[PDB]
Amino acid sequence: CTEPLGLKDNTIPNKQITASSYYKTWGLSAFSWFPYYARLDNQGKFNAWTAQTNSASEWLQIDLGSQKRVTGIITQGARDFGHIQYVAAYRVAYGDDGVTWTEYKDPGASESKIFPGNMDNNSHKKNIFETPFQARFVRIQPVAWHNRITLRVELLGC
């Protein structure tokens, strides 16, 4: 139960990947870093999701399309005009209706777990949830970043 859930191979459609906001270089639609570009190993100039602002109130939401057992996550950052960008730490939340959420916590913990993220633009960083959760929706909540909040993702499970 550690299989890719569909982000990298486009099985999860673009409309199912949303975010608090997305970046547009100098407001040009042509320079959009759409939420649905946040797919592992996405190639090209605009190959990742980048939040409009660098705030801990930003989030990337993935609708798996159906309930799945989520056991892990893999992330990458990206590069924009020679500048390395990536999320260095993040929390995870999940749910089934897309409007109510549960922040991931170790059993008995009062604080949501903060997962160690990337440290560069292309290396894959995998985290395994010691306590898998069942859910249709998953959101990644950046807590720390380098230059910009930028992500490419893949969720693992079955």
Curated annotation (Swiss-Prot):
One GO CC term on file = extracellular region
Q: Which example biological process does GO assign this protein? A: single fertilization
Give the subcellular location: Membrane; Secreted; Cytoplasmic vesicle, Secretory vesicle, Acrosome membrane
Listed name of the protein: Lactadherin
Q: In which tissues is it expressed?
A: Milk and spermatozoan. Also present in epididymis, kidney, heart, lymphatic gland and spleen but not esophagus, small intestine, muscle and liver.
> Highest taxon of the source?
Eukaryota
Q: List the disulfide bonds.
A: C1-C158
Record remark: domains: The F5/8 type C 2 domain mediates high-affinity binding to phosphatidylserine-containing membranes.
Q: Which gene encodes it?
A: MFGE8
Keywords carried by this UniProt record = Angiogenesis, Cell adhesion, Cytoplasmic vesicle, Disulfide bond, EGF-like domain, Fertilization, Glycoprotein, Membrane, Repeat, Secreted, Signal
The record describes the protein's role as:
Contributes to phagocytic removal of apoptotic cells in many tissues. Plays an important role in the maintenance of intestinal epithelial homeostasis and the promotion of mucosal healing. Promotes VEGF-dependent neovascularization. Specific ligand for the alpha-v/beta-3 and alpha-v/beta-5 receptors. Also binds to phosphatidylserine-enriched cell surfaces in a receptor-independent manner. Zona pellucida-binding protein which may play a role in gamete interaction.
